[PDB]
Symmetry: C2
Subunit: 97 residues, 2 copies
């Protein structure tokens, strides 16, 4: 139904464990996979989305500066799950291994 | 800047309400399960990845109800007026949990 729900289902299929809506360095991420690996879900727009480019930008720069690798999945990309699974795959394999 | 589910979570945290996230009750997946057969769902008119299938929503609610479950559905757009969603959740909680 929701982007997060869809990402969760992919993670379960790949048998990947995670903390949901987990706080890291004062920031919120959709899924935390450990070893400073996080997945975020975003999109150009949704009804209750309050735009803030500077905040979103700062968030990534701080996390990255602290050793975090963040994979941001766009809600549109979900209509092509085969590509999303690929992004999650590469992300997990190249960073956890 | 935050997903609808994230925004609902923050509300629950503020009200000091505990939950299972993306929980499955009677074969149906809910965004937040609060126990005592209480759940909160997050939906909306339509978004980027949403596939319209009301025949699964009309079924979900009707079946859960007969099993004793009570589901509060929050539309993504409702979050723009956060106070309205807080009072819904507050009343929902007090109603079935008193």
């Amino acid at each position: 139904t929701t982007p997060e729900r869809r990402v969760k289902e992919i993670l379960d299929e790949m048998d990947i464990v995670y903390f949901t809506h987990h706080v890291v360095e004062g920031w919120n991420v959709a899924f935390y996979l450990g070893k400073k690996l996080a997945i975020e879900v975003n999109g150009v727009y949704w009804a209750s989305k309050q735009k803030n480019v500077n905040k979103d930008k700062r968030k990534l720069s701080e996390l990255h500066s602290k050793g975090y690798r963040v994979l941001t999945i766009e809600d549109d990309e979900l209509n092509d799950i085969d590509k999303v699974k690929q992004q999650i795959q590469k992300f997990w394999v190249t960073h956890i291994s």
